[PDB]
Amino acid sequence: PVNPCCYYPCQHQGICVRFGLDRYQCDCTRTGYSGPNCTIPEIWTWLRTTLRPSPSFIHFLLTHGRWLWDFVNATFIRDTLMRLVLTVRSNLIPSPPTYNIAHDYISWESFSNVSYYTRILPSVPRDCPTPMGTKGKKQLPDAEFLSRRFLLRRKFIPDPQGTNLMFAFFAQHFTHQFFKTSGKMGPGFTKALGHGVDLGHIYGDNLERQYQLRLFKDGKLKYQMLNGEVYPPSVEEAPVLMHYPRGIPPQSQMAVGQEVFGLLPGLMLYATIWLREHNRVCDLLKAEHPTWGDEQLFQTARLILIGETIKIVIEEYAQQLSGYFLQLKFDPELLFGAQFQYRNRIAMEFNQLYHFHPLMPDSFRVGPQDYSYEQFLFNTSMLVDYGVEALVDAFSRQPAGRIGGGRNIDHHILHVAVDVIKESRVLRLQPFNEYRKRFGMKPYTSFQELTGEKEMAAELEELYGDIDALEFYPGLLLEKCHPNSIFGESMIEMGAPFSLKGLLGNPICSPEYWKASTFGGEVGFNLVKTATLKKLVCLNTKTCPYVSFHVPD
Template sequence: MGVKGKKTLPDVDLLVKTFFVRKKFRPDPQGSSVLMTFFAQHFTHMFFKTSYKTNAGATWSGHGVDVTSIYGSNVSDENLLRSFKDGKLRMQVLNNEEFPLYAKDARVYMMYPPGIPESSQFALGHPFFGLLPGLFLYQTIWMREHNRVCDILRGEHPDWDDERLYQTGKLIILGETIKIVVEDYVQHLASYYVNVAFKPEVLFGYPFQYSNKIVVEFNHLYHWHPLMPDSFNISGQQVEMKDYMFRSDLVVKHGTSAITDSLSRQRAGHMSHHNHGAVTLHVLRDTILHGRELRLQPFNNYRARFNLQPYTTFQELTGETKMAAELERLYGDIDAVEMYVGMLLEKRRKRALFGSTIVDMGAPFSVKGLLANPICSPIYWKPSTFGGDVGFDIVKTATLEKLFCNNIPGDCPLVSFRVPEFVEGDVDEGNNFNFRPPPRDEL
């Protein structure tokens, strides 16, 4: 900063007001569901753990996929969540389903504000996951899956003690997580015409470093708060965001089946400009300010670093004229636009959720972080790591749908990262993101 454009960066509150405040909910043109949004949030918070008390560039994460968001970030919390019997996690039965314990019964560190009823405070693997019921849903499903896996392992190895069952169960859950991320989540985000497959063995025999580091730019890039709607539809009942926060009890009340089905049918927001809800505007503001504090490079510099052609005009960046003119007035030079601002204002790539920079910059970080996990190495990618062929098969055949269907009582609900009614082009991006009417032959 300071080489191109104005001598001072634009006022952050002016930027937020001009380009990012949501006046009308803008649905994702690719039909992403809110179930996908919560998957992204639950998954990434195992390695995006900024230590703000230190500084915006510090982290308390382990720099990789380690499933600490399920089991706890330290041994003390892990032990509080464990039953120490048959390798399982501690659960309780509420409304005829298994759920995590209340926070009062397992004193792990949780971030509940004052005034939250005990019936909404649960002991979870991440202190943040009590914030939204969607996060609580994923936490519940993964904990049930761990216990289900331990039952299978105990049947295969009746002589194994609690510790071996628990640790092997964790490795299977880790493998399932990576498999689902690659073949369900990355597949959805990329919208490739071919199926993405998780096959660690394709790297065997090639030089590859099985370690990872989370860089701060990857963290900033992954601030996808526009995906969140302003309200949530639970079996036809609309719950406003302010009434949805710290309401894990809604999952208990309505049941995991109804919540999963509802989240699969509700469309997420478009990851773009003019689509930040009121609840997350402070996060957006802080992200821009943290980028300045850390002296992140301008947007175009990152494009050049990742072998992408830098934009030469503001209109080329945004794909329109009005925002382009306002951006030019505030920044003065296309090479002065800040990284996160540029990512949100960049025109969407065809058949993608985002502009090209988020896709092409984020993909290398994502793929490296997944395949660099030690379980993907030749030393560990074998049946013995996962308790034999049965455990290895659980990992290799894992899917998002199986994860939910194996752990929800009764008939399996809709489990999908894309809403069922989606049709390519059903959102008119040139007309205030209104839905286009269906073709006449569908009326």
């Protein structure tokens, strides 16, 4: 017979489970609903759901009250929302975590085997009619086609929000500390254990690699003076296993902590900046605490970077992206009264979703110059030629591409996009609509409703055959993005809960760690409480260039 859970009968997070040979049961426990399929609101949840506004409307508010917001922003009405935005958002992420590439059910292995990435929704039963479930054509769209047909850039549609490459790279850099798939174990697994903001894209993702990177003196990290300026050490002085092209492995071949940070000046640039900082903070610490050994002058140094990072990501990175008028704010105490699990676990769906590849331009302008991908990718001399300062002032000026709308992934990288959908299929992630539900939204009723226009809409229908079988990565990118937004609705509604759940789920964010001692002295704490993007740079440089997550003017 037909595996009954192939219809995804259970609603509102109700657990589906086969009983007997052809029967099934929903586990609406705390679902907030009662009944066979979890579709009977309890008195309260019914109130909640009736007095509950459209996610589309709440967005409207967050982006319109120039005045109401300038005022809510200068009063406590600020922390109250921030504290609200947090709790509510991250409450949609299961914690402890639930499934993986190998388990569509609760399990101890899933719980303890860090090796796995995790999922929010189970997978599409391997024995279901359609590869998506029950609806659609028994053959998903020719992956490579879709990619060129709808995601392939034509004319560069830039981010209406003012985003720039200075942001794009940070995004990339940052996201790699937790997103690290291995061809070894394959899709659905991850090298970057720890999951989250641990800077294991700096200090490396294993103890050894760290050590092989640490200068084991005054708690700093090795490095080298090239032109007077500081830079990461070369693999000739640090045996860290990199991925550079069989070229001049000795010099110019730097060791960073993130195996791939050599394939792009941006990622190396940043890797540099942070490293610059790290040692920079060591200098600071060692003064307040001379007696301090190497390890302490290292652990404390690290943590201060987890602070500054988690800090910048929310109050500036997230800010720019969101476009909200409400001043996002990083303050662990906002949850000290809430029920929250201080632990995160990267999710495959989060992974796929964070693919902002369309942010990347056509070419990379650096002042009067104008490097092509070919001359940019794997390039080397560029970082140490131009110098941090000037090379930042360059990305802080060249605009980023719009993530939403569709058709904006440059052809060079366009290959990625295809492997995402290919992998998405590997993993067996349920359909867009199925994920729209779990993140508090309604399923799109028609392809037309999904995209502002009618062209792609129809063409897409004569492919998947039903809005209900649309895929995850395609729908996210192909969704009519918000008015003047950098990307569609579903992007933030699905993105936020993952991002914050893990952004604040970091141990340092808990009451147990959030103390001045955890950063040895006030200086440490105040560094985490004062981190700026403009500071991460200008404090570790010779000169202060223009720097921001958005183009000037």
